[model samples]
Target: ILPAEILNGLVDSNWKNRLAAVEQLLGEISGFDAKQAGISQILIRTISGRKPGLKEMNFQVLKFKLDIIRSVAENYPLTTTTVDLVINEIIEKLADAKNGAAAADVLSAFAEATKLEYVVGKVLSFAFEQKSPKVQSEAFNWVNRSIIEFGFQLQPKTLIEDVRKGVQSTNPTVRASAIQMVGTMSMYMGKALMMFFDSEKPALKSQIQVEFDKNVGEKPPKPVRGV
Candidate 1:
């Protein structure tokens, strides 16, 4: 049974207690899905209701929780239902934060989830379509973190273009954020970055890109090997 104190903590205006509750729940996750689910339900409901306290799981806290949850997820068997809900919740809340670091946490979690269905379209679409510098930089960080966390190969060409179009903004923070971010994506990313200024894509204001799909693939397109 979910404890009354924990349930109350879910709605706590004091973000500290809520965080403690999250930590406790995480520690007890090995106990049962029921208890975990109860905690998840409270958090999810609070978030869904747009309650103020629930919205404060910004990038830093989200990143911390991602680390805890990622450890739990890797070591214990989580129900796909529970895991999927957790995954999508992170994606949803990160987008709402309009902050790159928080969004990057979800990208990290996405890398951790073994059977993640691709939501990069929704993620990348929000990145390109939105005008917020904070959100845009956050998206780049998310992409960058995913590369490191999963060791997923982001195509060199796409990485360069993404940085050029998004990070190389006139704003100093966004520009610096992009610089700090892409290096972790791949060693080739630096080589890719060098081409940024030299390329026509930067000279042009509108650099349209096809969303580079990594996860949604149904089957690996292949020609036979060992001919």
Candidate 2:
């Protein structure tokens, strides 16, 4: 326990004591008697329930709790509590902050979160259809890595449309990256890939032409190595 004098100083409402207490707490990320559950409770309480502070404070605290859960998931993998809540909260908070960088970071962390494979489509939809290319590209990486590591599926038609649109765009990077994204997306669905090529869309003729040119005489890519 902190010394009585110090505790008194910390709780004292006086300016000098308050500043001293802040300095004391700021000396370390935590105090001497740290408890994961306790820290989780305090942080979560600040971020949840009634009597919450300003919205930004709640969001910032949420980021802290999420960081803790993410670290626990990394080390223990199967032994974290309230993990689903953390993951769900992270997605909801970040989705709400779609234009914020913090949102993008949390979205990126989902690749390591439980059942994150399922949430990837949300990222794809949010990014491909809803948000900026930059944020979506960030989410794309997580979704890509998750798909490879977890054998998760991305909808083929959605991905094919994304590519067709991208390839038809005036920007070369969009055309190239979208084509590449489609090729990788093609890795998951033989039926989808076949349908994509077999379907006759005049709008996608150029992309179809390119895909055929690449795959017609070459061997199909193998199943991706899983994590």
Candidate 3:
């Protein structure tokens, strides 16, 4: 079947039909020449529910979409525009109770397929602007993971500055995730992270100090493999 026809199945009112379409797409995805087929564009539009008559997807359907994205990232060298759209879609799902973990799995694949800086930058930009504390916290978790994975490649001061905004968030979870990111950074940045937290209140500063102390002498874990 043609790729567009298979993609159309994703919007079918029947859940079984949608699931079957995704499975078929996953099986056939390896054969697709991304540039010629424009599979990424079609997949993105379907997953984002932007295609006319595409209904809101259930968790299983969402997971399949994420799996397709991971496969696409692994199989093709995506354009920056595709990457940006993929990141935006993934970030929107990060707060979902069922789909969030799968979304993060796709993110790890993105970090591997493209430059870490691009993935991290886009994530932070969209994630922070969201009013959802869950999204903000999940995005911070990715930041923390990125720090662990590629701490040396990142600019310490620049990263600290971005995460500083999270520290100031009103939500406790957002604040904790932001502080946790600093903790992970401290593992790599050492004492240098302290200066950025200086403007924070004494209590918050001390809390950050404790993160530094706890992470001291710890080594970052090995890089994670995507699903």
Per-prediction backbone clash count: 2, 0, 0
Off by over 4 Å in 1: 12-20, 34-50, 57-103, 114-123, 155-160, 179-186, 189-197, 200-227
Model 1 — TM-score against the truth? 0.52
- lDDT (Cα, tens digit) per residue for candidate 2, span 1-227: 44566445534545465445434433432443344444533333322332221133434443443443343333332222433334343543443453244544444444454445445655555555553454444444445445555554455566666555555656554555555555555555543464655554665555655654564354444434223
Number of the candidate with higher lDDT, 2 or 3: 3
Task: Give me the overall lDDT of model 2.
Answer: 0.46
Please name the candidate that would achieve the greatest lDDT relative to the true structure: 3
Q: Per-residue alpha-carbon lDDT of model 1 for 64-167, expressed as tens digits?
A: 45545555544444444444455544554554644434444544544444332243434555666766676666666666555544444445555566676655
Q: Which whole-number lDDT from 0 to 100 does residue 107 have in model 3? A: 82
Ranking of all predicted structures according to TM-score, beginning with the best and ending with the worst: 3, 1, 2
TM-score of model 2 vs. true structure? 0.46
Residue range with the least summed lDDT across 10 consecutive positions in model 1 = 208-217
lDDT of each model, Cα atoms only?
A: 0.49, 0.46, 0.75
Determine which window of 10 residues in candidate 3 has minimal summed lDDT: 48-57
List, residue by residue over 1-227, the lDDT tens digit for candidate 3: 35667766877778788788877877777876656665665555455544422124567876887888878778876656777765877887888888888788778778777777778888888886767888999999977876676554566666777889888888889989999988888777777667878778888888888887888668877655321
* Over 4 Å off, model 2: 1-69, 72-109, 153-176, 197-203, 208-227
